[PDB]
């Protein structure tokens, strides 16, 4: 009959903590068969050797499989699990659970929160960071939009993607088959996978025309970017998982989403603009926030507003960790709550050194 | 009659003196009138940070050849307070304080005073001996500042020592124990004892509440203007009192507030207001912002857990510095501001003082 | 008559069960006979290492499926001790202990024997204090009985997993009006390791009870066990104990020997432990099943009079460095970096050293 | 006739000149005869390591004061090669090379010889490319001549300091319309080390010019020098070269020998290098002046087929781990962790290995 999306931002005590989700299920507030996606901030280092991502997904899949009476593999085929590691600074570990009910109510007036999920095919290692990944992500984004019943791409406000990376073993597999990979480095492969996936969002939503995107442009032409894409790499899967979040004229949700783009890592004005775009027009209305979701990164210039920083020169602390700490702190200082989603590495996600920022709010 | 000028100078590396050299060579700074240099250096700000000493040595070399005197005499004349750790987007820079005596014709204006303490025994670090001696030099520096009312003191910056392996062996040889065995934790004890010395001198807390057992344990005791930073390269405390005096002709003033926690942007705006900055348009009057940052002992901020105290890969003082610099930068639009970590007895638990120096 | 078999298995990731599954599916391991798994997992080996729990969860879920029982029942039945930190060239792997009942002839001298025991859960304010010492000592005695070892001189390695403090657990303690032994999460690992190690020494008669008190724990480094190997983690709230030795009631084709490294570069002690396990020449290194060792930074900040920065390095915690060093030393003697090295050797060997054991085919 | 003396001096900090000053004040070192100082400094050895420059500044300032000349003049006369990173048990120290002409007899056989040479400054876009290879090769040949070595087989170690790319230098290159060899500050160290190492192999005839191109640099690991040892730093724009060998025109009471570690745990190569320097037994190890070696993670992510995480670890860069490992292996053979080990051995020995030299008293 009618889609109603509910979104639950749940604090976690550890990567494997399912207790807060279990409390909401046991109280009857969440039917677990209606969960379509879980977006996590997990407290590993968010870089190459972060096993909290897989630990969290495994723990959630185990739990939901037992509650639903189905196998873990069926849960993973059915539910998007997107775990973004790295909870630096004051950023609070948490999960955001997306529930899509089917209700016997009319659509609410105007446009209200809508979500769609789609998975791509698995990618061969030589496809990561290249047009194959761009075009297949674009196709899956369009599918998720239709799943969400969103017709106008301007009504898409955040497209969250989990994407793969290259391990030593996967690079060697490509080599044994006579293929080369986009880069022979696991950490850099995360940027290429994030960037190709983001360009696929831009292609699908019409933010960039197809004839401007080529292999040569991926992670090189920073004038090309999506204003709503948010992509995050991990070792666990070989495909991309996509969540499209926007507003539909055919939704019964009591929530809406809005967004802006941070021009740089300290752009508090963009945080306030994203809040306003989600209907939050004053500090007292900040209690309507469900979550804030943003991309952060170290600008390629090595500077912010003309001031040097060491992020790209610091050999002890990877720059994606520093970028996450900074943007989480900036958002937290505006909204008064560090339990917000910030992910690092914003290739083709907002301008160089900036990133999209979206707000899910109660109406 | 004293006048104080303050110069915030970006640096390209710990040993970079070129920005200071440009201002001297252009006549805008007379090196003989420099009384203190407060630096943010790009080492890790913890135990094995050698950018502090590298920066001090490079500056001492340079000012010695420019003043015709020896390096050793320069360090006895000028306070060098190098705070390592430039995490996040925090920009390495130095802040140079110039104090020139100029006869001139109301209103309170920036005044600065310096005072070195005697050298401390390692057994005295983090204990009442350090507290009482620091309180002495603060009043001494209050004097050089020509400031009579402690309510006119807005920031008290201190470089304090730490306990090395050999300084522990020394107290061991001499038959005396030290406040703690961990060299990293001695930084917190030296920082906290020094801070209590400021609260004691300024009458922020009465002396009968301060004991050895209260140091780094009773967080109800704290100064609202103290800012202390530890390093390996000395054994005494170097104190800079900054405030406003009627007997001053400076074109600057200093205000301050206290960050209740690491994301307290309201306190940043209050500090700006206390220094005469009332709108975003007037932000260009900032000379520098100076703040203390730290991880709260509860492991939380506004009820939300974070990993700073559980993260074995990144020391919590590094994270706290990144966070508070990003918050201040997002208010003033400029990450080149002074943030130092470890705020023991400096503002409440999880918070710290924040001061703004601004043109009038 | 018990027969112990030990399988050292390379792993591709913390959750990799494929090597164990291959041995089960080939018929080489009956999963019902597994009594303990000792892992090296590739997290940072410090407070915020979740690879330890990820590995245990993955193994318990796999074995639970294979055996037709719940995960909870598997973790009550099988010791899972995951030591994080695979720095330097140290290769991630698990060592699986299988114990079966057999009818076999007697008097094979003494051969490898294994026993397992668990303590109760500890409150945060008990870590690093006599309650942990005494509970561990009782469990060590139980594990010895499980191993059918009555003579403590026949115990060659006592491997323990023990808890640690997080900021959240310290705050729980404060809310209940209790003070923890130390207010630093990393240092809490040393107190839990040290108290657990002194519990081994108490149980084996290496130190008399009247010499152990709260004040001595992590302060009197001349108190130590020569066989204790303890390892701390966020993923458990009790201690798990594996006693490994030799007994006359054993039909194993394996034996264990040990020595004590006096410092982190004591290759002589590696060769002495090999010899105590019956490996008398480089030509016989192929009989190694695994080498198990403790490593640590010396409190003096030195090795043979030479300074190092392990205790002063704010970027890399000293147990990470000690593991890389001692693994490299062992690897250079035996020609294989896939050996067990655990860092932080409080009351485990002298200050700056630690026990080292070798499991070898006869 | 040239006489070379070499003093290995422990340091308490990067700026510690006291051990050197002791040797000068007692008359054992004439400061005007110092031609090079090779240091291990206790920074992280990567991009943001300022202990290297801090050490050089302190040494240049001290020597300029002793010789009555300017800092500028000292750095033009003396090679200062500070290699950061003292991980594991590796002990910070400096190795001071003293060379003087003498009127003395010969030939007592071949004895230690040293020569020094500097290259021009490099643009950022020349690092890791043939401009650096060829100019380094030119300078190695010059340093050979300064050492009075005509036979490349008598060169046993070629130590080099070379530049790296910072974010600001990469951005500047971009503004000038020039792309650099790699857009990554950490990886730029590998390209500078590797191009410099190939310069050595070219100068010494270890590899034909035919085989070297931009495309081969940090790609064809079959190309390598067996004596090159290179180390990158943020504190200079050129390459500084120290050639160390033996020649018939030497009156030193020292010799150098070398081998090549095939991998990070090749203790046999350590003993081979000792033997090549005349140290035939454990009893003769008191003749060591220093051991100098290159260490690295193999591009395969393995040692003798065993996986490690050095290339995967986002918390600790692999050159830090490699240094800890190889220093520990050497220390366990010679009983002393105060030896020189530098990380990143691109085109320096085979993939995963590196050269190792020993300077010994005859
Ligand atoms: O923030 C991020 C970005 C990514 O690519 N992968 C993560 O785990 N965390
Ligand atoms: O921020 C800080 C605090 C300290 O104690 N020492 C430093 O170098 N930086
Ligand atoms: O070991 C090393 C290698 C390098 O490239 N740079 C350093 O400072 N140390
Ligand atoms: Ca971007
Ligand atoms: Ca405070
Ligand atoms: Ca020990
Ligand atoms: Ca090599
Ligand atoms: Cl209800
Ligand atoms: Cl864990
Ligand atoms: Na799991």
Numbering used by the authors:
A (entry chain B): 0 to 283, 289 to 367
B (entry chain D): 1 to 105, 108 to 283, 289 to 367
C (entry chain A), D (entry chain C): 1 to 283, 289 to 367
Paper text:
The use of cyanuric acid hydrolase to solve this societal problem is being explored and the best candidate for this biotechnological application is the thermostable enzyme from Moorella thermoacetica. Consistent with the “Toblerone fold” observed for these enzymes, the RMCAH monomer is composed of three concatenated, highly divergent, but structurally homologous domains, which endows the enzyme monomer an internal pseudo-three-fold symmetry (Domains 1, 2). As observed for AtzD and ACAH, the active site of RMCAH lies on the pseudo-three-fold axis within each monomer and is formed by similar sets of residues from all three domains. As observed for ACAH and AtzD, each of the three serine γO atoms is in close proximity to a lysine residue (Lys40, Lys161 and Lys299), generating three pairs of Ser-Lys dyads each from one of the three isostructural domains from the same monomer.
